[PDB]
Amino acid sequence: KVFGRCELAAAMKRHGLDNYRGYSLGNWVCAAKFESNFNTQATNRNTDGSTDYGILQINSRWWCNDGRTPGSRNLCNIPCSALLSSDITASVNCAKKIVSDGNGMNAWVAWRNRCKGTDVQAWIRGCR
Ligand SMILES: O=C1C(Br)=CC(=C(c2cc(Br)c(O)c(Br)c2)c2ccccc2S(=O)(=O)O)C=C1Br
Ligand code: NA
Numbered sequence: 001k002v003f004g005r006c007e008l009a010a011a012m013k014r015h016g017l018d019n020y021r022g023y024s025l026g027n028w029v030c031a032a033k034f035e036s037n038f039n040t041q042a043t044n045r046n047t048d049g050s051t052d053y054g055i056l057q058i059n060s061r062w063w064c065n066d067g068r069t070p071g072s073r074n075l076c077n078i079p080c081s082a083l084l085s086s087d088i089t090a091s092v093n094c095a096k097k098i099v100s101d102g103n104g105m106n107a108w109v110a111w112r113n114r115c116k117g118t119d120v121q122a123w124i125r126g127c128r
Contacts, residue, residue: 001086003038003055005029006127008088015092021099026120027111028095032056033123034110040091041084054083054091056108063094 003011009029012018018025035057036042044052050061050069060069064080076094083091098107105111 001040003032003040003088005033005038005123008032008038008055009124009127011088012092015089017092017095020096021104023099023105024120026123027105027115029123030115030118030120031105031108031111034114035108040086040088043084051080053080055088056083056091056095057110058083058091058094058098063098 009025012028013025017023017028020028032038032055035052036055038055040055042054042057044057046052046059048061050059050072051066052059053064053066058064058076060066060080061072063074063076064078064083065072065074066080076090076097078090078094083094099105101107105116
């Protein structure tokens with residue numbers, strides 16, 4: 001599913017991401033924009049053999065099981081395919097674990113390089 005901007009904001013807000021660990025909703029929408037262009041079926045194969053999955057491009061080395069990332073963990077205790085669903089619940093709850101790592105949203109390269117420090121509030125402009 002390719003979400004609309006405010007459609008994703010509403011789903012992320014309903015799922016509690018607005019100011020989660022201090023990160024305003026716009027930060028999460030911005031991260032999803034640049035990680036996946038709002039597409040739940042986004043994937044990217046990395047150099048190390050891991051794969052990033054879903055609207056927030058969550059990685060199989062630590063967070064989900066795809067059966068093809070040797071030596072990896074499954075800390076969110078989900079198949080990586082669950083991160084591709086139209087329903088973003090699994091991606092959101094796994095992201096909450098990630099952002100609690102200690103490095104916050106810096107875990108998302110696209111957030112650090114394209115959202116951090118910018119006017120992230122624009123990403124929820126006009127939404128209810
Ligand atoms: O006592 C509660 C009550 Br009541 C609600 C909630 C949640 C919730 C709340 C709202 Br409101 C909502 O719109 C959605 Br969707 C889920 C929730 C449930 C499962 C997983 C994550 C959440 S989380 O989103 O809170 O992380 C958790 C506890 Br504990
Ligand atoms: Na894994």
